[PDB]
Amino acid sequence: AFGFLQQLLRWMDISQEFIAHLEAVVSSGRVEKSPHEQEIKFFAKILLPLINQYFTNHCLYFLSTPAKVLGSGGHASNKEKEMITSLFCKLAALVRHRVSLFGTDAPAVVNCLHILARSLDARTVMKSGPEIVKAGLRSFFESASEDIEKMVENLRLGKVSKGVGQNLTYTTVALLPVLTTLFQHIAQHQFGDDVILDDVQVSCYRTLCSIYSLGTTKNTYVEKLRPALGECLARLAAAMPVAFLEPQLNEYNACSVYTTKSPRERAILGLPNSVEEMCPDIPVLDRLMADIGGLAESGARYTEMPHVIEITLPMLCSYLPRWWERGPEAPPPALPAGAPPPCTAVTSDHLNSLLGNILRIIVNNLGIDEATWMKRLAVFA
């Protein structure tokens, strides 16, 4: 695996060499010689299917650790975990804003990104890893946040919807499905408290800030993008180590930038000086629950609340279960570690209240002719 991964990384710098040539010729100086035609075909037709199947079979080998072995036997070394992380980052940057240049090979690239994401032991890499490898993973989240911010501001009809077309097709086809898979992978393996710590949190906050900002937007593009945005936001909530819906209790959360970093810092990098101001347009948990309850009892149909059903509800359906285990009413093994008060106030009442509202929402739209959101809501609840 070490030699196989090293060759794959060797082809990654080769891949970056001819895509720039393709970008150059597609911009100026058209020429169909294609000096790297052999390299392009080998990368697309051999490497991508090989990466797709190799890491599908040996997914448990790379996710295994000496503390906890998942596969039949053996576990990847730290260097192997570092290389597979750099492979994901280089491949993601390769396809960034170049989905069209891959032609029919773009579905192959994103499928490799999905499988590489499911085989990322990011806990070990971020804890004990080289700065270069860690900086690559941080740059991926930062780049993802910037692309989503450009996407949402274009969905705000700042542009009719140049680079707007490239950014829009890259995010909805490559960035969003991959980011959803990566967050789901982090949530399943409890990597949130180890990966999203200092600058990933800032990147994840901006992604959380921007995605929810579609509530005050009414367009045709936004209507078809809600299922993708909602699923991505739900996975982010499961992996987010901070209770962004309960900023009043953030002082008791160890995995927060406002506790890990000094007040002297957090000013060299732009931060709003208060946890409540990170995403101020997100209603607090108490407010959010009241709004859903009011809509459910009012008998409102799906047409007058598409944002809540497609985005807000999946967020709460994933936020509450995560923080029910870390707050009051949890089954606490906290005889030694019970001194810090819980950073959340989620109890079984919140989950019970939300479930009752969801059931009332469904029956309000029980007899309508078309509702494709019911199947998506069922799996989230």
Next chain:
Amino acid sequence: GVTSEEELHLTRKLFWGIFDSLAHKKYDQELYRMAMPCLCAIAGALPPD
């Protein structure tokens, strides 16, 4: 039974022999169509470690 540490050596050479040769062969659709499954099968048999 299990491999005898010599079949794995043959399998490892078989993988890199095809991989290196295919990396320099000019693109042939027929060759690539059946060489790729061979590499995937070989890679899926060798232990990663």
